[PDB]
């Protein structure tokens, strides 16, 4: 049976060592700095059961169990839009799409290792042949069957950048001791969200050049492991729902994961030691996360472009034929993301195991294009709010016997309803004008590399070639 | 059979009167300013003969008898694929999409008619029941059966467009009689792309505000009517196809048409009087050959970034890490297009007579993206290049006794081939730094019409409302009543 | 003498009538929702009693009298520069000009009236003789004497822009009795920035089609008139100087001022009835906080610039070629604002009255090309930063005896001082990522008119022909 | 005497080796692909001889010979906006700075080694004391007595960019001989504008990475000198004045100097052998050239913003709201490289030698911001304009009995002036829509190195460092 949100938040009360700012957390679930975003996870579980979502929200297995569909593997186009509808349908449930690791995308990352686990075992180094392709799937069958939220924590240290040299003093999470039962690591993983609100950390690396073996690591703990510490930025969450409708649903937190001496045994490590290995198949690990990022970057845009129509059209300037092209822009933005989402299904491909994979190109460059243009999205849509996007009443000024009369009047725009311009002025300050909404935009920058480091992976990857068939047309045209 | 390309270059010498700057031309088919152009539209005949080509050239029809596929109508998507994939084949056999008003882009906008003939006639006002949609259908019959290319002249006079009460005085192609065989027209159908090189003229407006009725005018006339004058601008051809392997392949001209007292056959008027049909219906029309304008800007952008990956390999800046990321920029508008032609096919719908139309907002919401981003991208090529893009030996100057060993070594960069270089610059510099390269920027710019129109006419068009779907995320996440 | 910060603090317990968001203000000087930005106005007074800072922030006029330069009139190039100095000394002394509306900057636009008063008074219609030039010039010479904030509320209530017919129904300020003493007022300036802690309101209006006579009212009423109530945005002043050390120093409100039946002497009416006047007279007031934007551009461009060097060195990513060129966008950026400041100043001209004036088309392009580029600017430096931006230690996560030895190994860059990154944090993180950054953003983006209305005004005033001076290059070229 | 007009033309025909595409030039001054340039040299001359400009086009030395102003040093910031007024006066005069290598412009850069000559002369490596300070400064003075044009060639092959040991198989310029007479060179001076149409070529090299001691030649020879041979791309002037009222008017010509066992005598040798000298003086030598560019593109932006204000009174767009905005950005982009002249000259400083430079920042960050913004302003203009900017009649279609009616009719908007449109038409279409105007583009864009690289160099050459005076406010700010 699908986990329900009551067992998840008392989980959440298993000793786990988390620093939120300046403050302990004794319980993650109660806390008044996490409670909220605590209840958006038991949200999530609680949405599986729904008979009024079932169709979408879960599946029947070979076994005739019904599961979530956070564990649905695609194998063709259809259950690959089965699986988008059902991340589609999480995201508008959830504040239009204001918490993007969900369990539904932390866990979407495991497919990777269920499509071909054997070269996570034979390109081990040092385990002395104690990493089995075999116990990854078991330990993936475990999550599936508990419904257990798999935080990945892939990053390096942001320590220095000057030097290619700079990866023997880095405090990068490193295998201190092998022996028979498992290995001991120590240091950090410098970054991760979400990690005090899951059950397990996911332990990865990247390659970069001159990286030792003793800190590639590929495993699973659980977030209450003796000698962790999530060490959390403080919480935005805002304590009036009615001013923050959304800053008051719960701050998705961001941080480190400190790593004491932390014992892990063989059967929940995945790869060590092979520098070699970190290069593609984290790659392959990710790229999961990348296609969820165009659905998430077409749901943002598509909540944009909404709110311009919404606050142009209360103000009255929706028909003025300057504002009018606008507003064009943000439609033109959705349906672009909604192009490279809809192509990039179209144009895939299967993987080793027999996955369906949506086209790389498609997908990384949709992303290049959503964190090229967003700040601009960002600035149209509250440049055409005017001041209605910060300078609107609190609810008290609102509802006051003197205030009132002037506050209706003031808003009294051509589609009426003068306090929709105070409901549309909170959702575009909560999401542009706060702590809690520049998270996101910075989470939405970042999270997947920044633009600059997209376009230099895609590159690097892709190895485009004038000899190649991208450049067939060009050599043509030539007489090359 | 088929037309060939030599019965093409024949039927151009039937009398036209045609201007091509300060000259007349006696022949399109032979004067040295137009006889390029004409051999690339033979040329496009000719593609219909190839044998290895019959398959994406040509279908047979319900008749047993085979025909270009310019002619090919589509009601599913599989269909509209196999239409793509021959209009994508033509461009990229003709010199990388450098001449995008081949016949098949100018018959195309004729499947509005035959899918829905009926309102061309019922909501045309004046006509005294002379009009008949059964004689639309039948004139676009007569040019299938004779593979004919009616050239599209719609846009009115650029005169101006300070007020609508102007249009009083606009030399627009007016009705100025109606009697029991048909119409007489006067004035000018200001603009058309290739009319020189055509068969047939296809005659229809645009709703602008205050466009008079005398001024709805949709019909066919041949190029040769008489008191029909084609004026087209200077022709950029160039002589030496060495030096200009892409510009010496000849100028699709642009131009006006001037009707003087031009008698039409009710027979060939589609429609008169009504500036409400002119509204939604010409729309229609060029749905098609704005859906065609994303196949052209997918493999246009594709030429753009080949070029970039061919001249910074040349060069050897191709692995420097910031030159990288800039071909990245170039490639992904590529991948952009291609997305954009990709989700219009696959989100299309059913017209009322049952042919199959690609999602009107990705097409036309990616030539906006295009044409916004178009002139950055000829910029990033140009400023990749270096001076590889114009500073180059001429062919007489790298093969000089003296020159030869300095140019060889100047070229000589990580992929050898250093004649190679002076081949890309020569495609660079023909496609975006001579007159014939940005007459094509030109038109790419204002043929569908510019940026901001657009922009304009999609979301009239679309009447977006906060009560709409694009309201529904917003309403349920302020919490604003449905 | 000169006004001190404890006259000033003093002075504003005088029963004014304001709102902060859902509160009632009992007094604006010790409230903790407003008390911090009231004691940044209080350093503003306190700066011109310091004495190394006399020679910028003081002026001997003919009298012999010592006075704030903010009552300095400029009548040439030199004087003008003078002022300039001064402006940007105090932005510069308050933390980077992060509160942009100090007095110093409403009393500016007082200037335009002393220049030429009469045309005030002989434009009014319906005021049967009573506004008097000696009267304005009266009110600003009292306003200079005491160092009287007099805070600007001119622009109109953005109600319903389908309509020019919409001023019909505006519920704008509106003269609803005039008698032999004064005028009654009754509705709303329905914007202002600092006016809960100004001595004075400023009202005015610029023309709209079809705006009535009857609102057509330029004045100055105390802040604590009977029946003005001052309706503020809540406070989001942070309580951590620590954390947040410049968000803890006060928000600088915004807001809007309600008149029920208010009286104003005739003394304080600077005029009223006439549309044509409302013009372009309103336009010369705004003209000297349109130059006095380019001073604050300048600052917060040299800001950003400077936060980029920092950052990209601390990171170690300054000497990355890409990285390079980026930061020397945000340079060029701030070298634009600064070209355009001196520009301004050196193609200047006289008004009527003698005062030295800069060039208008320079400044107010100028203020096109920061909003044109500014959110783009706030793109770099964050996406340069990358996660030091947001991720970093609280100062007790910093200061535990677990976590410090990793947090000094992770910020452990080329320029040593790893806790300097959490210093640059914070700075880029209140000025950009925080509710209190965000108030400053949009601030600069509206206060003045955004970038589609500077463009619009700017080509109205200036009534740029092709037969003008502007394209006789243009004519000779074409040979017309 | 000044040079004349005549003079010149006569001086071309000296035996010069010049190829004009597949074509050899048997006399520059009279070929027809090469006449119309050498006459437009021909008016620059004579430009100096026109009684109502000589206060422009002239000074009084401290001899009492009247000279070119382009001969003019300038000690001061008056002189130096008397130079700029000169250099202003000349490209206005020639086609509105369609040709920006008049002589002017080629012998600014000789003032570098006027100001401050010992350097090249104490550095030299390899010279036997051969060169000598006194001989730099006698060929100076002889140019300027004679007026001679001497044309710099200093760029390197663009050979292969992946290779910094690029250099050792470098075509560019070496020397293979020293004796006591001279220097010996073979090889190629890659890229020139103009050389063809020049007396002199002044050779000098920038510094790179490894570059040998035997390349870095700085000097001066004839166009004419035995193994010299200029190699010029096909010339793209215009039959048709008429229809192409400034691409008839001859074509800037740019290409390559090939030099086969050249001797250059001690005399005429300014500098040899150390790269280290390579690097800041040639900048120094450029810096006159970039300052000159921010006249260019002061004067290139008001013709642009011009002809937008032109053709859109002509067509009926100028009063619609959305055209108003689009040409407030072409003013706007004017009117900043007029701010960015100005600055520059008023923030100056005086070089070793006593001459006064305008500020390198504010010109070379100006050159930035002209060539990312350049495209986008062809762009508008011809987007502004319509099928006007292309599609218009041809004269002889123009004046046909039958088309006139229709063409008049046609172009008939609210100022009238038909036959105005065209004239218009063939300016818009002359600069950015042939050849002969793309061409002007290009060299705008890379002759004073393209946008990366003005970014990429000024940042080398300035030294911005967070201790430095910029980061001075980010510091105080952060608490640094
Ligand atoms: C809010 C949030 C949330 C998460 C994460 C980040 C943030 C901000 N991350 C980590 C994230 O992927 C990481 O921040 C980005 O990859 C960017 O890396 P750095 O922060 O180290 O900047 P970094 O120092 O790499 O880059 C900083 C800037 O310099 C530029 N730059 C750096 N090197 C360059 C070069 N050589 N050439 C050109 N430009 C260069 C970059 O392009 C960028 O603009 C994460 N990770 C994870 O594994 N799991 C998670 O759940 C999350 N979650
Ligand atoms: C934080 C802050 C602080 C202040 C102020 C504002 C704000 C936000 N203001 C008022 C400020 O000047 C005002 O907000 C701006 O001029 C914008 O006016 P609106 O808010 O009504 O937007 P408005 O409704 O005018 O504009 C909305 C958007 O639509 C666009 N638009 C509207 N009409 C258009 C048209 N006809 N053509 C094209 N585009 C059009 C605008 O360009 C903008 O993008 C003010 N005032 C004051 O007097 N004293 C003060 O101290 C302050 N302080
Ligand atoms: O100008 N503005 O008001 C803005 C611009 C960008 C942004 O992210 C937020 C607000
Ligand atoms: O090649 N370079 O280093 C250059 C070239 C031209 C210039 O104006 C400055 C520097």
Redesign the pocket.
């Known amino acids: 049976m699908i986990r329900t949100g009551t067992q998840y938040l008392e989980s959440l009360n298993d000793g786990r060592n988390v620093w939120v700012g300046n403050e302990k957390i004794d319980n993650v679930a109660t806390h008044p700095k996490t409670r909220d975003y605590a209840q958006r996870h038991a949200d999530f579980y609680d949405l599986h059961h729904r008979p009024d979502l079932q169709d979408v929200m879960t599946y029947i297995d070979e076994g005739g169990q019904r599961r979530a569909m956070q564990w649905f593997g695609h194998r063709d186009k259809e259950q690959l839009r089965r699986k988008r509808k059902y991340h589609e349908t999480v995201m508008r449930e959830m504040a239009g799409a204001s918490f993007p690791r969900t369990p539904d995308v932390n866990n979407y990352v495991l497919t990777t290792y269920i499509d071909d686990p054997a070269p996570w075992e034979t390109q081990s180094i040092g385990d002395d042949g104690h990493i089995k392709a075999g116990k990854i799937v078991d330990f993936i069958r475990y999550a599936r069957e508990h419904d257990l939220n798999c935080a990945p924590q892939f990053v390096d240290p942001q320590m220095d950048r000057s030097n290619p040299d700079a990866q023997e003093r880095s405090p990068g999470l490193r295998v201190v001791e092998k022996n028979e039962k498992g290995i001991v690591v120590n240091g950090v993983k410098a970054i991760g969200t979400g990690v005090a609100f899951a059950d397990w950390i996911h332990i990865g690396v990247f390659f970069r050049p001159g990286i030792p073996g003793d800190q590639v690591i590929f495993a699973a703990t659980p977030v209450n492991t003796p000698g962790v510490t999530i060490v959390c930025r403080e919480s935005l969450v805002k304590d009036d729902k009615v001013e923050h409708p959304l800053a008051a649903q719960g701050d998705e937190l961001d941080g480190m994961t400190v790593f004491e001496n932390v014992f892990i045994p063989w059967s929940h490590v995945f790869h060590i030691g092979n520098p070699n290995h970190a290069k593609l198949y984290p790659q392959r690990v990710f790229d999961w996360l990348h296609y969820h990022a165009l659905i998430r970057q077409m749901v943002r845009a598509e909540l944009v472009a909404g709110l311009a129509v919404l606050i142009?059209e209360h103000?009255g300037?929706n028909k003025?034929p300057?504002?009018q092209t606008?507003v064009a822009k943000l439609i033109g933005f959705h349906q672009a993301m909604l192009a490279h989402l809809i192509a990039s299904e179209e144009l895939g491909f299967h993987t080793p195991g027999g996955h369906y994979k949506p086209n790389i190109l498609i997908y990384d460059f949709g992303r290049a294009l959503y964190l090229e243009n967003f700040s601009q999205m960002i600035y149209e849509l509250v440049?055409?709010?005017?001041?209605?996007?910060?300078?609107f009443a609190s609810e008290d000024q609102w509802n006051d016997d003197k205030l009132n009369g002037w506050f209706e009047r003031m808003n009294n725009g051509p589609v009426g309803r003068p306090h929709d311009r105070v409901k549309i002025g909170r959702v575009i300050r909560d999401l542009f004008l706060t702590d809690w909404g520049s998270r996101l935009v910075v989470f939405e920058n970042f999270n997947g590399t920044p633009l600059q480091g997209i376009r230099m992976l895609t590159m690097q990857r892709a190895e485009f070639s004038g000899s190649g068939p991208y450049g067939k047309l060009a050599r043509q045209v030539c007489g090359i």
């Not at 440049?383 to 300078?391: E, H, Q, T």
Request: hydrophobic share 50%; glycine share 6%.
């Open positions: 142009t103000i300037t003025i300057a504002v606008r440049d055409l709010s005017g001041r209605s996007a910060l300078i």
